[PDB]
């Protein structure tokens, strides 16, 4: 279950629907679990995204978190591998609409894959999300996990904060549940994850794209 030494390959596939605007993202990159570093590039295979890239970051692989030597046993994410887990989130933008996401995260071959459905409903076509009024950045957030023994897995809740192009700040409340898809697996006690992100572009890629680096530690 420790497939997580060395540079592991990542594929991410998301299919979205925000207010009927449909889009599709594919991303490929590397994950270094031992250092908790993710390096990825994402592309829109459906022309310019209806929504801002930063609001997709949390949706677009927490098994690659760096888990300390001391607490290495409260790592649900690798523990359910490679059957995978189901990660479900409800992301509720304050004063705007909400995303539903169901994702299966598991191994095909040597490769870690994250397959996402995202349904977005109730968005203003003129607020910060559908109106593309959000800056292209991403701060550091700490994701508060807890054991959900009633499904054998994880519940997190956390607030993401998107800087808005007008000095205001847009709130995105995340609720998250993770279940293990199959035998017994680990049940963390009560820890959180410190995640920081660098968002950037590739001067060569023409399609809607986000290049992304990330460090995650437990």
Coordinates of N, CA, C and O in Angstrom, one line a residue, residues 23-171:
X23 N -18.0 22.1 -19.7 CA -16.6 22.2 -19.9 C -15.9 20.9 -19.4 O -16.6 20.1 -18.7
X24 N -14.7 20.7 -19.8 CA -14.0 19.5 -19.6 C -12.5 19.8 -19.4 O -11.9 20.5 -20.2
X25 N -11.9 19.2 -18.3 CA -10.5 19.5 -18.0 C -9.8 18.2 -17.9 O -10.4 17.2 -17.4
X26 N -8.6 18.1 -18.4 CA -7.7 17.0 -18.4 C -6.3 17.5 -17.9 O -5.9 18.6 -18.3
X27 N -5.7 16.8 -17.0 CA -4.5 17.2 -16.4 C -3.5 16.1 -16.2 O -3.9 15.0 -15.8
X28 N -2.2 16.4 -16.4 CA -1.2 15.3 -16.3 C 0.0 15.9 -15.6 O 0.4 17.1 -15.7
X29 N 0.6 15.1 -14.7 CA 1.8 15.6 -14.0 C 2.3 14.5 -13.1 O 2.0 13.3 -13.2
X30 N 3.1 14.9 -12.1 CA 3.9 14.1 -11.2 C 3.4 14.3 -9.8 O 3.1 15.4 -9.4
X31 N 3.5 13.3 -8.9 CA 3.4 13.4 -7.5 C 4.5 12.8 -6.7 O 4.8 11.6 -6.9
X32 N 5.1 13.5 -5.8 CA 6.1 13.0 -4.8 C 5.5 13.0 -3.4 O 5.6 14.0 -2.7
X33 N 5.0 11.8 -3.1 CA 4.4 11.7 -1.7 C 5.4 11.9 -0.6 O 5.1 12.6 0.4
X34 N 6.6 11.4 -0.8 CA 7.6 11.5 0.3 C 7.9 13.0 0.7 O 8.0 13.3 1.8
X35 N 7.9 13.9 -0.3 CA 8.0 15.3 -0.1 C 6.7 16.0 -0.2 O 6.7 17.2 0.0
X36 N 5.6 15.3 -0.5 CA 4.3 16.0 -0.5 C 4.2 17.1 -1.5 O 3.6 18.1 -1.3
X37 N 4.8 16.9 -2.7 CA 4.8 17.9 -3.8 C 4.1 17.3 -5.0 O 4.2 16.2 -5.4
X38 N 3.2 18.2 -5.5 CA 2.4 17.9 -6.7 C 2.8 18.9 -7.8 O 2.9 20.1 -7.5
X39 N 3.0 18.4 -9.0 CA 3.4 19.3 -10.1 C 2.5 18.9 -11.3 O 2.5 17.7 -11.7
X40 N 1.6 19.8 -11.7 CA 0.6 19.3 -12.7 C 0.3 20.4 -13.7 O 0.6 21.6 -13.5
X41 N -0.2 20.0 -14.9 CA -0.7 21.0 -15.9 C -2.0 20.5 -16.3 O -2.3 19.3 -16.5
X42 N -3.0 21.5 -16.4 CA -4.4 21.2 -16.7 C -4.8 22.0 -17.9 O -4.4 23.2 -18.1
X43 N -5.6 21.4 -18.8 CA -6.1 21.9 -20.0 C -7.6 21.8 -20.1 O -8.1 20.8 -19.7
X44 N -8.2 22.8 -20.7 CA -9.6 22.7 -21.1 C -9.7 22.2 -22.5 O -9.3 22.8 -23.5
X45 N -10.4 21.0 -22.6 CA -10.6 20.3 -23.9 C -11.9 20.8 -24.5 O -12.5 20.1 -25.3
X46 N -12.5 21.9 -24.1 CA -13.8 22.4 -24.6 C -13.8 23.9 -24.8 O -14.8 24.6 -24.7
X47 N -12.6 24.6 -25.1 CA -12.6 26.0 -25.2 C -12.7 26.7 -23.9 O -13.1 26.1 -22.9
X48 N -12.4 28.1 -23.9 CA -12.2 28.8 -22.7 C -13.2 28.5 -21.5 O -14.4 28.3 -21.8
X49 N -12.7 28.3 -20.3 CA -13.5 27.8 -19.2 C -14.6 28.8 -18.9 O -14.4 30.0 -18.9
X50 N -15.8 28.3 -18.7 CA -16.9 29.2 -18.1 C -16.6 29.7 -16.7 O -17.2 30.7 -16.3
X51 N -15.7 29.0 -15.9 CA -15.4 29.4 -14.5 C -14.0 29.7 -14.4 O -13.1 29.2 -15.2
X52 N -13.6 30.4 -13.3 CA -12.2 30.7 -13.1 C -11.4 29.5 -12.6 O -11.9 28.7 -11.8
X53 N -10.2 29.4 -13.1 CA -9.3 28.2 -12.7 C -9.2 28.1 -11.1 O -9.3 26.9 -10.7
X54 N -9.1 29.1 -10.3 CA -8.9 28.9 -8.9 C -10.0 28.1 -8.2 O -9.8 27.3 -7.3
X55 N -11.3 28.4 -8.7 CA -12.4 27.7 -8.1 C -12.4 26.2 -8.5 O -13.3 25.5 -8.0
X56 N -11.5 25.8 -9.4 CA -11.4 24.3 -9.7 C -10.3 23.7 -8.9 O -10.2 22.4 -8.9
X57 N -9.4 24.4 -8.3 CA -8.2 23.9 -7.7 C -8.6 22.7 -6.7 O -8.1 21.6 -6.8
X58 N -9.4 23.0 -5.7 CA -9.6 22.0 -4.7 C -10.3 20.8 -5.3 O -10.0 19.7 -4.9
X59 N -11.1 20.9 -6.4 CA -11.6 19.8 -7.0 C -10.5 19.0 -7.8 O -10.5 17.8 -7.7
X60 N -9.8 19.7 -8.6 CA -8.7 19.1 -9.4 C -7.6 18.5 -8.5 O -7.3 17.3 -8.6
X61 N -6.0 15.4 -5.1 CA -5.3 14.1 -5.0 C -4.5 14.1 -3.6 O -3.3 14.0 -3.6
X62 N -5.3 14.1 -2.5 CA -4.7 14.3 -1.2 C -3.9 13.1 -0.7 O -3.3 13.2 0.4
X63 N -3.9 12.0 -1.4 CA -3.0 10.9 -1.1 C -1.6 11.3 -1.2 O -0.7 10.6 -0.6
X64 N -1.2 12.3 -2.0 CA 0.2 12.7 -2.1 C 0.6 13.7 -1.0 O 1.7 14.3 -1.2
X65 N -0.2 13.9 0.0 CA 0.2 14.7 1.2 C 1.5 14.1 1.8 O 1.7 12.9 1.7
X66 N 2.3 15.0 2.3 CA 3.5 14.5 3.1 C 3.0 14.2 4.5 O 2.5 15.1 5.2
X67 N 3.1 12.9 4.9 CA 2.6 12.5 6.2 C 3.8 12.3 7.1 O 4.7 11.5 6.8
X68 N 3.9 13.0 8.3 CA 5.0 12.9 9.2 C 5.3 11.4 9.6 O 4.4 10.6 9.7
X69 N 6.6 11.2 9.9 CA 7.0 9.9 10.4 C 6.2 9.5 11.7 O 5.8 8.4 11.8
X70 N 5.9 10.5 12.5 CA 5.3 10.2 13.8 C 3.8 9.8 13.6 O 3.4 8.7 14.1
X71 N 3.1 10.6 12.9 CA 1.7 10.4 12.6 C 1.4 9.6 11.3 O 0.3 9.7 10.7
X72 N 2.4 8.8 10.8 CA 2.2 8.2 9.5 C 1.0 7.2 9.4 O 0.7 6.8 8.3
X73 N 0.4 6.9 10.6 CA -0.6 5.9 10.6 C -2.0 6.4 10.4 O -3.0 5.7 10.1
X74 N -2.2 7.7 10.6 CA -3.5 8.4 10.4 C -3.7 9.0 9.0 O -4.2 10.1 8.8
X75 N -3.2 8.2 8.0 CA -3.3 8.6 6.6 C -4.3 7.7 6.0 O -4.0 6.6 5.5
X76 N -5.6 8.2 6.0 CA -6.6 7.4 5.3 C -6.3 7.3 3.8 O -6.4 6.2 3.3
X77 N -5.8 8.3 3.2 CA -5.8 8.4 1.7 C -5.0 7.3 1.1 O -5.5 6.6 0.2
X78 N -3.7 7.1 1.5 CA -2.9 6.0 1.0 C -3.5 4.7 1.5 O -3.4 3.6 0.8
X79 N -4.1 4.7 2.7 CA -4.5 3.4 3.3 C -5.6 2.7 2.5 O -5.6 1.5 2.5
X80 N -6.5 3.4 1.8 CA -7.5 2.8 1.0 C -6.9 2.5 -0.4 O -7.7 2.4 -1.4
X81 N -5.6 2.5 -0.6 CA -5.1 2.3 -2.0 C -4.8 0.9 -2.2 O -4.4 0.1 -1.3
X82 N -4.9 0.4 -3.5 CA -5.4 1.1 -4.7 C -6.8 1.0 -5.1 O -7.2 1.5 -6.2
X83 N -7.7 0.3 -4.3 CA -9.1 0.3 -4.7 C -9.6 1.7 -4.9 O -10.5 1.9 -5.8
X84 N -9.0 2.7 -4.3 CA -9.4 4.1 -4.4 C -10.3 4.5 -3.3 O -10.7 3.7 -2.4
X85 N -10.7 5.8 -3.3 CA -11.7 6.3 -2.5 C -12.6 7.1 -3.4 O -12.3 7.5 -4.5
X86 N -13.8 7.3 -2.8 CA -14.8 8.3 -3.3 C -14.7 9.5 -2.5 O -14.7 9.5 -1.2
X87 N -14.4 10.7 -3.1 CA -14.3 12.0 -2.5 C -15.5 12.8 -3.0 O -15.6 13.0 -4.2
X88 N -16.4 13.2 -2.1 CA -17.5 14.0 -2.5 C -17.5 15.3 -1.8 O -17.1 15.4 -0.6
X89 N -17.7 16.4 -2.6 CA -17.7 17.7 -2.0 C -18.9 18.5 -2.4 O -19.4 18.4 -3.5
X90 N -19.3 19.4 -1.5 CA -20.3 20.5 -1.8 C -19.5 21.8 -1.5 O -19.1 22.0 -0.4
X91 N -19.4 22.6 -2.5 CA -18.7 23.9 -2.4 C -19.7 25.0 -2.7 O -20.2 25.1 -3.8
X92 N -19.9 25.8 -1.6 CA -21.0 26.7 -1.6 C -20.4 28.1 -1.6 O -19.8 28.5 -0.5
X93 N -20.5 28.8 -2.7 CA -19.9 30.2 -2.8 C -20.9 31.1 -2.1 O -22.1 31.1 -2.4
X94 N -20.4 32.0 -1.3 CA -21.3 32.8 -0.5 C -21.9 33.8 -1.5 O -21.3 34.3 -2.4
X95 N -23.2 34.0 -1.4 CA -24.0 34.9 -2.3 C -24.0 34.4 -3.7 O -24.5 35.2 -4.6
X96 N -23.6 33.2 -4.0 CA -23.6 32.7 -5.4 C -24.1 31.3 -5.4 O -24.7 30.8 -4.4
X97 N -23.8 30.5 -6.4 CA -24.2 29.1 -6.6 C -23.3 28.1 -5.8 O -22.6 28.4 -4.9
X98 N -23.4 26.9 -6.3 CA -22.7 25.8 -5.6 C -22.3 24.7 -6.6 O -23.1 24.4 -7.5
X99 N -21.2 24.1 -6.3 CA -20.6 22.9 -7.0 C -20.9 21.7 -6.2 O -20.7 21.7 -5.0
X100 N -21.3 20.6 -6.8 CA -21.3 19.3 -6.3 C -20.3 18.5 -7.1 O -20.2 18.6 -8.3
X101 N -19.5 17.7 -6.4 CA -18.5 16.9 -7.0 C -18.5 15.5 -6.5 O -18.4 15.4 -5.2
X102 N -18.5 14.6 -7.3 CA -18.2 13.2 -7.0 C -16.9 12.8 -7.7 O -16.8 13.1 -8.9
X103 N -16.0 12.3 -7.0 CA -14.7 11.9 -7.6 C -14.2 10.5 -7.1 O -14.3 10.2 -5.9
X104 N -13.8 9.7 -8.1 CA -13.1 8.5 -7.7 C -11.6 8.7 -7.9 O -11.2 9.1 -9.0
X105 N -10.9 8.4 -6.8 CA -9.4 8.6 -6.9 C -8.8 7.2 -6.6 O -9.0 6.6 -5.5
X106 N -8.1 6.7 -7.6 CA -7.6 5.3 -7.5 C -6.5 5.1 -8.5 O -6.3 5.9 -9.3
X107 N -5.9 3.9 -8.4 CA -4.8 3.5 -9.3 C -5.3 2.8 -10.6 O -6.0 1.8 -10.5
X108 N -5.0 3.3 -11.8 CA -4.9 2.5 -13.0 C -3.4 2.3 -13.3 O -2.7 3.3 -13.5
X109 N -3.0 1.1 -13.4 CA -1.6 0.8 -13.6 C -0.7 1.4 -12.6 O -1.1 1.4 -11.4
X110 N 0.4 1.8 -13.0 CA 1.4 2.6 -12.2 C 0.9 4.0 -11.9 O 1.6 4.7 -11.1
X111 N -0.3 4.4 -12.4 CA -0.7 5.8 -12.5 C -1.8 6.1 -11.5 O -2.8 5.2 -11.3
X112 N -1.8 7.2 -10.8 CA -2.9 7.7 -9.9 C -3.9 8.5 -10.8 O -3.4 9.4 -11.5
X113 N -5.1 8.1 -10.7 CA -6.1 8.9 -11.5 C -7.2 9.5 -10.5 O -7.6 8.9 -9.5
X114 N -7.7 10.6 -10.9 CA -8.7 11.4 -10.2 C -9.8 11.7 -11.3 O -9.6 12.6 -12.1
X115 N -11.0 11.0 -11.2 CA -12.1 11.2 -12.2 C -13.2 11.9 -11.5 O -13.8 11.4 -10.4
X116 N -13.6 13.1 -12.0 CA -14.5 14.0 -11.3 C -15.7 14.3 -12.1 O -15.6 14.6 -13.3
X117 N -16.9 14.2 -11.5 CA -18.1 14.8 -12.0 C -18.3 16.1 -11.1 O -18.2 16.0 -9.9
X118 N -18.7 17.2 -11.8 CA -19.0 18.4 -11.1 C -20.2 19.0 -11.8 O -20.2 19.3 -13.0
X119 N -21.3 19.2 -11.0 CA -22.5 19.9 -11.4 C -22.5 21.2 -10.6 O -22.4 21.2 -9.4
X120 N -22.7 22.3 -11.4 CA -22.7 23.6 -10.7 C -24.1 24.2 -11.0 O -24.4 24.3 -12.2
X121 N -24.8 24.5 -10.0 CA -26.1 25.1 -10.2 C -26.2 26.4 -9.4 O -25.6 26.6 -8.4
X122 N -27.1 27.3 -9.9 CA -27.6 28.5 -9.2 C -26.6 29.7 -9.3 O -26.6 30.5 -8.4
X123 N -25.7 29.7 -10.3 CA -24.7 30.8 -10.4 C -25.3 31.9 -11.2 O -25.9 31.8 -12.3
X124 N -25.2 33.1 -10.6 CA -25.2 34.4 -11.3 C -24.3 34.3 -12.5 O -23.1 33.9 -12.4
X125 N -24.8 34.7 -13.7 CA -23.9 34.9 -14.9 C -23.1 36.1 -14.8 O -22.3 36.5 -15.8
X126 N -23.1 36.8 -13.7 CA -22.6 38.2 -13.6 C -21.9 38.4 -12.2 O -21.6 39.6 -12.0
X127 N -21.8 37.4 -11.4 CA -21.0 37.4 -10.2 C -19.6 37.0 -10.5 O -19.2 36.7 -11.7
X128 N -18.9 36.7 -9.4 CA -17.4 36.5 -9.4 C -17.0 35.2 -10.1 O -15.9 35.1 -10.6
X129 N -17.9 34.3 -10.3 CA -17.5 33.0 -10.8 C -17.8 33.0 -12.3 O -16.9 32.9 -13.2
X130 N -19.1 33.0 -12.7 CA -19.4 33.0 -14.1 C -19.0 34.3 -14.8 O -18.7 34.3 -16.0
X131 N -18.8 35.4 -14.0 CA -18.4 36.6 -14.6 C -16.8 36.8 -14.7 O -16.4 37.8 -15.2
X132 N -16.1 35.8 -14.3 CA -14.6 35.8 -14.3 C -14.1 37.1 -13.7 O -13.3 37.8 -14.2
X133 N -14.5 37.3 -12.4 CA -14.1 38.4 -11.7 C -13.1 38.0 -10.5 O -13.0 38.7 -9.6
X134 N -12.5 36.8 -10.6 CA -11.6 36.3 -9.6 C -10.1 36.3 -10.1 O -9.8 35.8 -11.2
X135 N -9.2 36.8 -9.2 CA -7.8 36.9 -9.5 C -7.2 35.5 -9.7 O -7.8 34.5 -9.1
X136 N -6.1 35.4 -10.3 CA -5.4 34.2 -10.7 C -4.4 33.9 -9.6 O -3.2 33.9 -9.8
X137 N -4.8 33.6 -8.4 CA -3.9 33.3 -7.3 C -4.5 32.2 -6.4 O -5.6 31.7 -6.6
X138 N -3.8 31.9 -5.3 CA -4.2 30.9 -4.4 C -3.4 30.8 -3.1 O -2.2 30.5 -3.2
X139 N -4.1 31.1 -2.0 CA -3.4 31.2 -0.7 C -3.2 29.9 -0.1 O -3.4 28.8 -0.7
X140 N -2.9 29.8 1.2 CA -2.6 28.6 1.9 C -3.8 28.3 2.9 O -4.2 29.1 3.7
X141 N -4.3 27.1 2.8 CA -5.5 26.8 3.6 C -5.1 25.5 4.3 O -4.3 24.7 3.9
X142 N -5.8 25.3 5.4 CA -5.6 24.1 6.2 C -7.0 23.4 6.3 O -8.0 24.0 6.6
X143 N -6.9 22.2 5.8 CA -8.1 21.4 5.7 C -8.3 20.5 6.9 O -7.4 19.8 7.3
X144 N -9.4 20.7 7.6 CA -9.7 20.1 8.9 C -10.4 18.7 8.7 O -11.6 18.7 8.5
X145 N -9.6 17.6 8.8 CA -10.1 16.3 8.6 C -10.7 15.8 10.0 O -10.4 16.4 11.0
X146 N -11.5 14.8 9.9 CA -12.0 14.1 11.1 C -12.5 12.7 10.6 O -12.8 12.5 9.4
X147 N -12.4 11.8 11.5 CA -12.9 10.4 11.2 C -14.4 10.4 11.1 O -15.1 10.9 12.0
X148 N -14.9 9.8 10.1 CA -16.4 9.5 9.9 C -16.5 8.0 10.0 O -16.4 7.3 9.0
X149 N -16.7 7.5 11.3 CA -16.7 6.1 11.5 C -18.0 5.5 10.9 O -18.1 4.2 10.7
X150 N -19.0 6.3 10.7 CA -20.3 5.8 10.2 C -20.3 5.4 8.7 O -21.2 4.8 8.2
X151 N -19.3 5.9 7.9 CA -19.0 5.3 6.6 C -17.6 4.8 6.5 O -17.1 4.4 5.5
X152 N -16.8 4.7 7.7 CA -15.4 4.4 7.6 C -14.7 5.3 6.7 O -14.5 5.0 5.5
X153 N -14.4 6.5 7.1 CA -13.7 7.5 6.2 C -13.4 8.8 6.8 O -13.0 8.9 8.0
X154 N -13.7 9.9 6.0 CA -13.2 11.2 6.3 C -14.4 12.2 6.1 O -15.1 12.1 5.2
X155 N -14.4 13.2 7.0 CA -15.1 14.4 6.8 C -14.2 15.6 7.0 O -13.5 15.7 8.1
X156 N -14.1 16.5 6.1 CA -13.5 17.8 6.2 C -14.5 18.9 6.0 O -15.5 18.7 5.3
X157 N -14.2 20.0 6.7 CA -14.9 21.3 6.3 C -13.9 22.4 6.4 O -13.0 22.4 7.3
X158 N -13.9 23.2 5.4 CA -12.9 24.3 5.3 C -13.4 25.4 4.4 O -14.2 25.2 3.5
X159 N -13.0 26.7 4.7 CA -13.3 27.8 3.9 C -12.2 28.2 3.0 O -11.0 28.4 3.5
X160 N -12.4 28.2 1.7 CA -11.5 28.8 0.7 C -11.9 30.2 0.4 O -13.0 30.5 0.4
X161 N -10.9 31.0 0.1 CA -11.1 32.5 0.0 C -10.4 32.9 -1.3 O -9.2 32.8 -1.4
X162 N -11.2 33.4 -2.3 CA -10.7 33.8 -3.5 C -10.6 35.3 -3.6 O -11.6 36.0 -3.3
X163 N -9.4 35.8 -3.9 CA -9.3 37.3 -4.0 C -10.0 37.7 -5.3 O -9.9 37.2 -6.4
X164 N -10.9 38.7 -5.1 CA -11.7 39.2 -6.2 C -11.1 40.4 -6.8 O -10.3 41.2 -6.2
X165 N -11.3 40.6 -8.1 CA -10.6 41.7 -8.9 C -11.0 43.1 -8.4 O -10.5 44.0 -9.1
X166 N -11.8 43.2 -7.4 CA -12.3 44.5 -6.9 C -12.0 44.7 -5.4 O -12.6 45.6 -4.8
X167 N -11.0 44.0 -4.9 CA -10.6 44.1 -3.5 C -11.4 43.3 -2.5 O -10.9 42.9 -1.5
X168 N -12.7 43.0 -2.8 CA -13.5 42.1 -2.0 C -12.9 40.6 -2.1 O -12.0 40.3 -2.9
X169 N -13.5 39.7 -1.4 CA -13.0 38.4 -1.2 C -14.2 37.4 -1.3 O -15.2 37.7 -0.6
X170 N -14.1 36.4 -2.1 CA -15.3 35.5 -2.3 C -15.1 34.2 -1.5 O -14.0 33.6 -1.6
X171 N -16.1 33.8 -0.8 CA -16.0 32.7 0.1 C -16.5 31.5 -0.6 O -17.5 31.5 -1.3

